[PDB]
Amino acid sequence: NSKLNPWAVVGFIDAEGSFMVRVRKNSKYKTGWLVVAIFSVTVDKKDLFLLESLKTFFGGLGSIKKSGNSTFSYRIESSEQLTKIILPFFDKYSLITEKLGDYLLFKKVLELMGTKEHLTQRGLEKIVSLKASINKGLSEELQAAFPQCVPTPRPEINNKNIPDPFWLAGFVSGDGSFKSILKKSESIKVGFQSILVFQITQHARDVKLMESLISYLGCGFIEKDSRGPWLYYTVTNFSDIQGKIIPFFHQYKIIGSKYGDYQDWCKIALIMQNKNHLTPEGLNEIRALKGGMNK
Numbered sequence: 001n002s003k004l005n006p007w008a009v010v011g012f013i014d015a016e017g018s019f020m021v022r023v024r025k026n027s028k029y030k031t032g033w034l035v036v037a038i039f040s041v042t043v044d045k046k047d048l049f050l051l052e053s054l055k056t057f058f059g060g061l062g063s064i065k066k067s068g069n070s071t072f073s074y075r076i077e078s079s080e081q082l083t084k085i086i087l088p089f090f091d092k093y094s095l096i097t098e099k100l101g102d103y104l105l106f107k108k109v110l111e112l113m114g115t116k117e118h119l120t121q122r123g124l125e126k127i128v129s130l131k132a133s134i135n136k137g138l139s140e141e142l143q144a145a146f147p148q149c150v151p152t153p154r155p156e157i158n159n160k161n162i163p164d165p166f167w168l169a170g171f172v173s174g175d176g177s178f179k180s181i182l183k184k185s186e187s188i189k190v191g192f193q194s195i196l197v198f199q200i201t202q203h204a205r206d207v208k209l210m211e212s213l214i215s216y217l218g219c220g221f222i223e224k225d226s227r228g229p230w231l232y233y234t235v236t237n238f239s240d241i242q243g244k245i246i247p248f249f250h251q252y253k254i255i256g257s258k259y260g261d262y263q264d265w266c267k268i269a270l271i272m273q274n275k276n277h278l279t280p281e282g283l284n285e286i287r288a289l290k291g292g293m294n295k
Helices: 006-016 045-057 079-090 099-114 121-132 140-145 165-175 204-216 238-251 259-274 280-290
Strands: 018-025 033-044 063-068 071-076 176-184 192-203 221-224 230-235
Touching: 006 033, 006 045, 006 079, 006 099, 006 165, 018 099, 018 121, 033 045, 033 079, 033 099, 033 121, 045 063, 045 071, 071 079, 079 099, 099 121, 165 176, 165 192, 165 238, 176 259, 192 204, 192 238, 192 259, 204 221, 204 230, 230 238, 238 259
Parallel strands: none
Antiparallel strands: 018 033, 033 071, 063 071, 176 192, 192 230, 221 230
């Protein structure tokens, strides 16, 4: 239908999905805590349809909740069903970013939950350990409840290459940026120039992936923020954009709202090429060239 490509999904999750372990106080349990494993994705209301798609893609599992005012989240939080359906998926269609690190720790948490070890003090602790290593780790409340807690070290995995072009479409769908800047012309005559920029932003921990985009798309360069750990894969060459970026993503489509921006960006590219005319300086050089071609 508009049934999503499986690698697009993984691209999208690498960019924007959360593997969460929720650990709250609860008097009904022997340890005094409730553990809940959560697969979750949150977007602006303009991407509600993308949440609906994704839910459908996972068999209709989980819930879509309006978080508040202008956001929505898709989450699955039954551990039976994460184990039956989500784990086999991500074990087959593998994540490639540091997100994959989160996925593997998330999966140790679920294995302990299938054994029901999570209800024991000991199992509880191992899980707070595993949680400490997912993403930003332990909240101030949880650090204070488990001061004796050592995070589980992240397993430090291997060369993970882009697995399918559909992955990158998914990935760019969250982490990706199609821009158009209007500047003054560098000329006597007042005129305007559109500059287009395709850009991917990512934390520097995913550097191997970022560097690899240059071969993968056949263009662009890397830039590092001088002030923190941010890398920008940028394409600004207009041929490359016409010739490589626009053809790629026309075949291997952006999903969600941002496809609309890609479309507008493509339209601006036609207008740049068709509704322009030569500067007086450009007119001059071409006149001289023609004013001595073919003697």
